[PDB]
């Protein structure tokens, strides 16, 4: 209950929230059924509209008007935004030439340039080019400020997950808003778009920008507008807040538009009805910029124009029905649409089996437009697993499609022609970023980046220390003229050992054999040098990775590769090798097929053994440095060292072999040489972070050899591909992957065919950022380059998406 018979007199859009049963006058009282009786009358005025006209100029103030054209309006801070244009002969902001903003040009008493976040729902990245003719204000912001060709949202590419990721710098798995609908089993409560529950604070984890600001003495406008409050009134409210006294005035503001998303759902992303929504959003940007110009703030405020996700063509007839695959379709609860999430309808059902549900949805129709996953098997780049609110069974839905439980759900819930929520690398899901103001660069294009990075930057813009988040602070320093954050490289925690020859062959009882006894100061001195690291500059191009946790490991040098060998996990943490464009692929000689050789640098006690692999009928093995890429028949012997071996399911060996035998050479040909770093990853609790030894759930049978959940490779070359990877004078180019180490190839419906028809497709799906691999390994790469650290941070955040051009 709220006693709503108090008044909003002088309280319209008050910044501090009053506690019930006192009536509220803040911009979210509507959503709480808590506004004072006179909120509409006083705070939602509309009389005479939103624009000054010639006849209204110099009028006598009438307090009933929506906005004012009287002489006193500027000092009262409540002119219509076009006041100076119509009444004072001024030009619209959009009609003025852009001029570099080298320093903040602010009124006396402004302690820092304000930040205004202008968020637009469903604003697809290609609208910038395709709607450019009807968006002159936005187009001016874009060309004169700092812009990216697109900005990558988070998965799922829905509204709240993305807006709250903007506010926190966190993955949805961490902030807790994992979809537009959720069930939380601990709370035993559900979150929905409609309803009051979404306003309960227990859903919203992390620390959003307004809280970060408040705790550090920076005041914030509200980050919620009631849907029925018109956009003109939202703008006038922000402009009114900017006229407050210094001690009362916020430094950070948010505007939000429900468009173009709203129309996009109805008409599709490029429906002819879409021109009007884009026109109208532009006009709002115009009103803001004119209003700022009036208040002498258009060269003071930093403006961020940002979308939450894009929009795809999706219609009712492109729906897959779970009723066409499952027999027990009524024992499941499905969160439907552009993604699927499945759980048991009742916890009291002991006959519910996720394994039989997955199997029944796997590769069952020729052109099947979704793929089932246990959430821990989803591409790691999605970071979509570590939350009790994400159901164990997930369906990745093809772009342009829906999934639903039964056909009756679709006609008794065609209306809609647009939707979104798909995989966040899908081009149609990409959205926008422009930054304009004294703190952003002038007329600058930056590479596409992920929305998880903006929180740090907004903190930088406001002089705030960001809460712990998933951005990489410094990766976006190139967006900024000033206020850059100067990060330092993390300190190495564990220094390596450099073992020499310390064990005789006969001390090993590993059950390994090799035909290598087939036996000169020419090549005996030469092989000594290779084992001491004479080739290390060729194969370790960017310095050795740093180990950022406490562990025991050895550097091992070889002619063709270098590794950091973990005595704890009994395998390399990393293996580094360079393959030039001229390099030759050879095969494993017949006499060396099953060869594994003890490493006389590493004790039997800290080695793997061949018997374990023989005994384990499921688990086989592979090699991190590929024998196929040996520089000579003699060097090849090095690749069969027990210290280069890793556990691999036969199913996975098909993938790995094709990558090593075919794709490495192909990349070296295309990229003019590549440096490769490969290794294992253990993430049994699917939290995106390196497992400790006590978190491992699977070992090679009868041994302490742990089984990786994934294999990574980081593949680096020169951005200027006219220079070979090993002689690159400038910027680097990278692509990486984190392949799941699975005992079947069920993920790939065409795996019964030759690896040339399915493997690369799998690898692209599991593309990754270096940073993703960093989290998962506790390693820090690119320690020794000729490049600035911020440029290297940008490199580490890069995701090779394999999509076509935007
Ligand atoms: C992306 O960036 C984020 C942010 O930096 C990274 O997430 C952080 O990672 C840390 C490492 O996992 C984690 O630290 C833990 O915090 C525990 C206390 O957490 C509370 O307090 C913090 C700080 O205010 C708060 O942010 C947390 O909020 C979480 O939980 C609430 C609900 O309870 C949600 O509203 C919110 O969304 C958030 O949930 C998310 O994180 C939790 C994990 O905390 C997940 O469970 C959720 O699914 C969701 O993703 C909390 O309110 C602290 O108690 C932990 O310490 C225990 O565990 C460690 C083991 O490493 C051990 O060393 C300690 O001794 C201690 O052990 C004891 O408890 C164990 C478990 O109960 C038990 O097994 C032991 O036997 C002991 O009894 C730990 O320090 C930090 O909380 C999160 N922060 C956030 C916001 O998510 C994230 O890793 C990044 N991702 C990537 C890929 O890089
Ligand atoms: C849906 C919604 C919820 C909340 C919200 N309510 N409680 C909470 O922690 N949050 C984050 C907010 C903030 C700005 C008040 C805005 C919106 Cl659009
Ligand atoms: C920019 C932005 C807008 C909104 C937002 N959502 N709805 C609304 O009116 N606003 C203002 C939110 C909510 C989800 C906390 C967060 C951010 Cl970073
Ligand atoms: Ca949205
Ligand atoms: Ca882990
Ligand atoms: Cl959802
Ligand atoms: K075996
Ligand atoms: Na298959
Ligand atoms: Zn939408």
JSON list of N, CA and C in Angstrom, two decimals, residues 113-158:
[
{"chain": "A", "resi": 113, "resn": "UNK", "atom": "N", "xyz": [33.54, 16.69, -17.02]},
{"chain": "A", "resi": 113, "resn": "UNK", "atom": "CA", "xyz": [32.53, 16.65, -18.08]},
{"chain": "A", "resi": 113, "resn": "UNK", "atom": "C", "xyz": [31.46, 15.57, -17.79]},
{"chain": "A", "resi": 114, "resn": "UNK", "atom": "N", "xyz": [30.16, 15.94, -17.89]},
{"chain": "A", "resi": 114, "resn": "UNK", "atom": "CA", "xyz": [29.14, 14.91, -17.66]},
{"chain": "A", "resi": 114, "resn": "UNK", "atom": "C", "xyz": [29.19, 13.83, -18.74]},
{"chain": "A", "resi": 115, "resn": "UNK", "atom": "N", "xyz": [28.63, 12.67, -18.41]},
{"chain": "A", "resi": 115, "resn": "UNK", "atom": "CA", "xyz": [28.44, 11.59, -19.35]},
{"chain": "A", "resi": 115, "resn": "UNK", "atom": "C", "xyz": [26.95, 11.36, -19.56]},
{"chain": "A", "resi": 116, "resn": "UNK", "atom": "N", "xyz": [26.54, 11.34, -20.82]},
{"chain": "A", "resi": 116, "resn": "UNK", "atom": "CA", "xyz": [25.17, 10.95, -21.18]},
{"chain": "A", "resi": 116, "resn": "UNK", "atom": "C", "xyz": [25.23, 9.70, -22.02]},
{"chain": "A", "resi": 117, "resn": "UNK", "atom": "N", "xyz": [24.59, 8.65, -21.51]},
{"chain": "A", "resi": 117, "resn": "UNK", "atom": "CA", "xyz": [24.48, 7.42, -22.26]},
{"chain": "A", "resi": 117, "resn": "UNK", "atom": "C", "xyz": [23.13, 7.43, -23.01]},
{"chain": "A", "resi": 118, "resn": "UNK", "atom": "N", "xyz": [23.18, 7.38, -24.33]},
{"chain": "A", "resi": 118, "resn": "UNK", "atom": "CA", "xyz": [21.96, 7.41, -25.14]},
{"chain": "A", "resi": 118, "resn": "UNK", "atom": "C", "xyz": [21.77, 6.00, -25.69]},
{"chain": "A", "resi": 119, "resn": "UNK", "atom": "N", "xyz": [20.98, 5.17, -25.01]},
{"chain": "A", "resi": 119, "resn": "UNK", "atom": "CA", "xyz": [20.84, 3.80, -25.48]},
{"chain": "A", "resi": 119, "resn": "UNK", "atom": "C", "xyz": [19.60, 3.62, -26.34]},
{"chain": "A", "resi": 120, "resn": "UNK", "atom": "N", "xyz": [19.78, 2.87, -27.42]},
{"chain": "A", "resi": 120, "resn": "UNK", "atom": "CA", "xyz": [18.71, 2.63, -28.39]},
{"chain": "A", "resi": 120, "resn": "UNK", "atom": "C", "xyz": [18.50, 1.13, -28.52]},
{"chain": "A", "resi": 121, "resn": "UNK", "atom": "N", "xyz": [17.27, 0.70, -28.30]},
{"chain": "A", "resi": 121, "resn": "UNK", "atom": "CA", "xyz": [16.95, -0.72, -28.37]},
{"chain": "A", "resi": 121, "resn": "UNK", "atom": "C", "xyz": [16.84, -1.27, -29.81]},
{"chain": "A", "resi": 122, "resn": "UNK", "atom": "N", "xyz": [17.50, -2.40, -30.06]},
{"chain": "A", "resi": 122, "resn": "UNK", "atom": "CA", "xyz": [17.40, -3.09, -31.36]},
{"chain": "A", "resi": 122, "resn": "UNK", "atom": "C", "xyz": [18.07, -2.37, -32.51]},
{"chain": "A", "resi": 123, "resn": "UNK", "atom": "N", "xyz": [19.00, -1.47, -32.19]},
{"chain": "A", "resi": 123, "resn": "UNK", "atom": "CA", "xyz": [19.66, -0.68, -33.22]},
{"chain": "A", "resi": 123, "resn": "UNK", "atom": "C", "xyz": [20.79, -1.47, -33.90]},
{"chain": "A", "resi": 124, "resn": "UNK", "atom": "N", "xyz": [20.42, -2.20, -34.94]},
{"chain": "A", "resi": 124, "resn": "UNK", "atom": "CA", "xyz": [21.36, -3.01, -35.72]},
{"chain": "A", "resi": 124, "resn": "UNK", "atom": "C", "xyz": [22.51, -2.19, -36.31]},
{"chain": "A", "resi": 125, "resn": "UNK", "atom": "N", "xyz": [23.71, -2.78, -36.33]},
{"chain": "A", "resi": 125, "resn": "UNK", "atom": "CA", "xyz": [24.93, -2.08, -36.74]},
{"chain": "A", "resi": 125, "resn": "UNK", "atom": "C", "xyz": [24.86, -1.46, -38.14]},
{"chain": "A", "resi": 126, "resn": "UNK", "atom": "N", "xyz": [24.19, -2.14, -39.07]},
{"chain": "A", "resi": 126, "resn": "UNK", "atom": "CA", "xyz": [24.14, -1.66, -40.44]},
{"chain": "A", "resi": 126, "resn": "UNK", "atom": "C", "xyz": [23.16, -0.50, -40.66]},
{"chain": "A", "resi": 127, "resn": "UNK", "atom": "N", "xyz": [22.36, -0.17, -39.65]},
{"chain": "A", "resi": 127, "resn": "UNK", "atom": "CA", "xyz": [21.51, 1.03, -39.71]},
{"chain": "A", "resi": 127, "resn": "UNK", "atom": "C", "xyz": [22.37, 2.28, -39.91]},
{"chain": "A", "resi": 128, "resn": "UNK", "atom": "N", "xyz": [23.58, 2.30, -39.35]},
{"chain": "A", "resi": 128, "resn": "UNK", "atom": "CA", "xyz": [24.46, 3.48, -39.49]},
{"chain": "A", "resi": 128, "resn": "UNK", "atom": "C", "xyz": [24.72, 3.86, -40.95]},
{"chain": "A", "resi": 129, "resn": "UNK", "atom": "N", "xyz": [24.96, 2.86, -41.77]},
{"chain": "A", "resi": 129, "resn": "UNK", "atom": "CA", "xyz": [25.19, 3.08, -43.19]},
{"chain": "A", "resi": 129, "resn": "UNK", "atom": "C", "xyz": [23.86, 3.14, -43.93]},
{"chain": "A", "resi": 130, "resn": "UNK", "atom": "N", "xyz": [22.98, 2.17, -43.66]},
{"chain": "A", "resi": 130, "resn": "UNK", "atom": "CA", "xyz": [21.74, 2.01, -44.44]},
{"chain": "A", "resi": 130, "resn": "UNK", "atom": "C", "xyz": [20.66, 3.07, -44.16]},
{"chain": "A", "resi": 131, "resn": "UNK", "atom": "N", "xyz": [20.61, 3.57, -42.93]},
{"chain": "A", "resi": 131, "resn": "UNK", "atom": "CA", "xyz": [19.66, 4.63, -42.61]},
{"chain": "A", "resi": 131, "resn": "UNK", "atom": "C", "xyz": [20.28, 6.02, -42.58]},
{"chain": "A", "resi": 132, "resn": "UNK", "atom": "N", "xyz": [21.50, 6.14, -43.08]},
{"chain": "A", "resi": 132, "resn": "UNK", "atom": "CA", "xyz": [22.28, 7.37, -42.95]},
{"chain": "A", "resi": 132, "resn": "UNK", "atom": "C", "xyz": [21.59, 8.63, -43.48]},
{"chain": "A", "resi": 133, "resn": "UNK", "atom": "N", "xyz": [20.82, 8.48, -44.57]},
{"chain": "A", "resi": 133, "resn": "UNK", "atom": "CA", "xyz": [20.11, 9.60, -45.20]},
{"chain": "A", "resi": 133, "resn": "UNK", "atom": "C", "xyz": [19.05, 10.21, -44.32]},
{"chain": "A", "resi": 134, "resn": "UNK", "atom": "N", "xyz": [18.49, 9.42, -43.42]},
{"chain": "A", "resi": 134, "resn": "UNK", "atom": "CA", "xyz": [17.43, 9.93, -42.57]},
{"chain": "A", "resi": 134, "resn": "UNK", "atom": "C", "xyz": [17.89, 10.19, -41.12]},
{"chain": "A", "resi": 135, "resn": "UNK", "atom": "N", "xyz": [19.19, 10.05, -40.87]},
{"chain": "A", "resi": 135, "resn": "UNK", "atom": "CA", "xyz": [19.72, 10.24, -39.50]},
{"chain": "A", "resi": 135, "resn": "UNK", "atom": "C", "xyz": [20.87, 11.24, -39.41]},
{"chain": "A", "resi": 136, "resn": "UNK", "atom": "N", "xyz": [20.61, 12.52, -39.77]},
{"chain": "A", "resi": 136, "resn": "UNK", "atom": "CA", "xyz": [21.73, 13.45, -39.89]},
{"chain": "A", "resi": 136, "resn": "UNK", "atom": "C", "xyz": [22.41, 13.78, -38.54]},
{"chain": "A", "resi": 137, "resn": "UNK", "atom": "N", "xyz": [21.67, 13.80, -37.43]},
{"chain": "A", "resi": 137, "resn": "UNK", "atom": "CA", "xyz": [22.26, 14.08, -36.12]},
{"chain": "A", "resi": 137, "resn": "UNK", "atom": "C", "xyz": [23.18, 12.96, -35.64]},
{"chain": "A", "resi": 138, "resn": "UNK", "atom": "N", "xyz": [22.68, 11.73, -35.76]},
{"chain": "A", "resi": 138, "resn": "UNK", "atom": "CA", "xyz": [23.43, 10.53, -35.43]},
{"chain": "A", "resi": 138, "resn": "UNK", "atom": "C", "xyz": [24.65, 10.42, -36.34]},
{"chain": "A", "resi": 139, "resn": "UNK", "atom": "N", "xyz": [24.45, 10.70, -37.63]},
{"chain": "A", "resi": 139, "resn": "UNK", "atom": "CA", "xyz": [25.54, 10.67, -38.61]},
{"chain": "A", "resi": 139, "resn": "UNK", "atom": "C", "xyz": [26.62, 11.70, -38.31]},
{"chain": "A", "resi": 140, "resn": "UNK", "atom": "N", "xyz": [26.23, 12.86, -37.76]},
{"chain": "A", "resi": 140, "resn": "UNK", "atom": "CA", "xyz": [27.22, 13.86, -37.34]},
{"chain": "A", "resi": 140, "resn": "UNK", "atom": "C", "xyz": [28.02, 13.36, -36.12]},
{"chain": "A", "resi": 141, "resn": "UNK", "atom": "N", "xyz": [27.32, 12.84, -35.11]},
{"chain": "A", "resi": 141, "resn": "UNK", "atom": "CA", "xyz": [27.98, 12.23, -33.96]},
{"chain": "A", "resi": 141, "resn": "UNK", "atom": "C", "xyz": [28.99, 11.18, -34.39]},
{"chain": "A", "resi": 142, "resn": "UNK", "atom": "N", "xyz": [28.55, 10.29, -35.29]},
{"chain": "A", "resi": 142, "resn": "UNK", "atom": "CA", "xyz": [29.38, 9.19, -35.78]},
{"chain": "A", "resi": 142, "resn": "UNK", "atom": "C", "xyz": [30.64, 9.67, -36.53]},
{"chain": "A", "resi": 143, "resn": "UNK", "atom": "N", "xyz": [30.48, 10.60, -37.46]},
{"chain": "A", "resi": 143, "resn": "UNK", "atom": "CA", "xyz": [31.61, 11.04, -38.27]},
{"chain": "A", "resi": 143, "resn": "UNK", "atom": "C", "xyz": [32.58, 11.98, -37.53]},
{"chain": "A", "resi": 144, "resn": "UNK", "atom": "N", "xyz": [32.07, 12.78, -36.61]},
{"chain": "A", "resi": 144, "resn": "UNK", "atom": "CA", "xyz": [32.91, 13.76, -35.94]},
{"chain": "A", "resi": 144, "resn": "UNK", "atom": "C", "xyz": [33.52, 13.22, -34.66]},
{"chain": "A", "resi": 145, "resn": "UNK", "atom": "N", "xyz": [32.87, 12.21, -34.07]},
{"chain": "A", "resi": 145, "resn": "UNK", "atom": "CA", "xyz": [33.36, 11.59, -32.85]},
{"chain": "A", "resi": 145, "resn": "UNK", "atom": "C", "xyz": [34.24, 10.38, -33.12]},
{"chain": "A", "resi": 146, "resn": "UNK", "atom": "N", "xyz": [34.16, 9.43, -32.20]},
{"chain": "A", "resi": 146, "resn": "UNK", "atom": "CA", "xyz": [34.85, 8.16, -32.29]},
{"chain": "A", "resi": 146, "resn": "UNK", "atom": "C", "xyz": [33.78, 7.07, -32.51]},
{"chain": "A", "resi": 147, "resn": "UNK", "atom": "N", "xyz": [33.95, 6.23, -33.51]},
{"chain": "A", "resi": 147, "resn": "UNK", "atom": "CA", "xyz": [32.94, 5.20, -33.79]},
{"chain": "A", "resi": 147, "resn": "UNK", "atom": "C", "xyz": [33.57, 3.87, -34.13]},
{"chain": "A", "resi": 148, "resn": "UNK", "atom": "N", "xyz": [32.84, 2.78, -33.89]},
{"chain": "A", "resi": 148, "resn": "UNK", "atom": "CA", "xyz": [33.26, 1.47, -34.34]},
{"chain": "A", "resi": 148, "resn": "UNK", "atom": "C", "xyz": [32.32, 1.06, -35.47]},
{"chain": "A", "resi": 149, "resn": "UNK", "atom": "N", "xyz": [32.78, 0.22, -36.40]},
{"chain": "A", "resi": 149, "resn": "UNK", "atom": "CA", "xyz": [31.89, -0.29, -37.46]},
{"chain": "A", "resi": 149, "resn": "UNK", "atom": "C", "xyz": [30.72, -1.09, -36.85]},
{"chain": "A", "resi": 150, "resn": "UNK", "atom": "N", "xyz": [30.98, -1.74, -35.71]},
{"chain": "A", "resi": 150, "resn": "UNK", "atom": "CA", "xyz": [29.92, -2.34, -34.90]},
{"chain": "A", "resi": 150, "resn": "UNK", "atom": "C", "xyz": [30.42, -2.68, -33.51]},
{"chain": "A", "resi": 151, "resn": "UNK", "atom": "N", "xyz": [29.50, -2.99, -32.62]},
{"chain": "A", "resi": 151, "resn": "UNK", "atom": "CA", "xyz": [29.85, -3.40, -31.28]},
{"chain": "A", "resi": 151, "resn": "UNK", "atom": "C", "xyz": [29.16, -4.73, -31.04]},
{"chain": "A", "resi": 152, "resn": "UNK", "atom": "N", "xyz": [29.91, -5.66, -30.46]},
{"chain": "A", "resi": 152, "resn": "UNK", "atom": "CA", "xyz": [29.41, -7.02, -30.24]},
{"chain": "A", "resi": 152, "resn": "UNK", "atom": "C", "xyz": [28.69, -7.09, -28.91]},
{"chain": "A", "resi": 153, "resn": "UNK", "atom": "N", "xyz": [27.39, -7.48, -28.94]},
{"chain": "A", "resi": 153, "resn": "UNK", "atom": "CA", "xyz": [26.68, -7.63, -27.68]},
{"chain": "A", "resi": 153, "resn": "UNK", "atom": "C", "xyz": [27.09, -8.89, -26.94]},
{"chain": "A", "resi": 154, "resn": "UNK", "atom": "N", "xyz": [26.45, -9.16, -25.80]},
{"chain": "A", "resi": 154, "resn": "UNK", "atom": "CA", "xyz": [26.61, -10.46, -25.15]},
{"chain": "A", "resi": 154, "resn": "UNK", "atom": "C", "xyz": [25.49, -11.43, -25.53]},
{"chain": "A", "resi": 155, "resn": "UNK", "atom": "N", "xyz": [25.75, -12.72, -25.34]},
{"chain": "A", "resi": 155, "resn": "UNK", "atom": "CA", "xyz": [24.75, -13.78, -25.49]},
{"chain": "A", "resi": 155, "resn": "UNK", "atom": "C", "xyz": [24.03, -14.03, -24.17]},
{"chain": "A", "resi": 156, "resn": "UNK", "atom": "N", "xyz": [22.68, -14.19, -24.19]},
{"chain": "A", "resi": 156, "resn": "UNK", "atom": "CA", "xyz": [21.81, -14.07, -25.35]},
{"chain": "A", "resi": 156, "resn": "UNK", "atom": "C", "xyz": [21.58, -12.62, -25.71]},
{"chain": "A", "resi": 157, "resn": "UNK", "atom": "N", "xyz": [21.43, -12.36, -27.00]},
{"chain": "A", "resi": 157, "resn": "UNK", "atom": "CA", "xyz": [21.35, -11.00, -27.53]},
{"chain": "A", "resi": 157, "resn": "UNK", "atom": "C", "xyz": [19.92, -10.44, -27.34]},
{"chain": "A", "resi": 158, "resn": "UNK", "atom": "N", "xyz": [19.51, -10.42, -26.07]},
{"chain": "A", "resi": 158, "resn": "UNK", "atom": "CA", "xyz": [18.27, -9.84, -25.60]},
{"chain": "A", "resi": 158, "resn": "UNK", "atom": "C", "xyz": [18.57, -8.55, -24.83]}
]
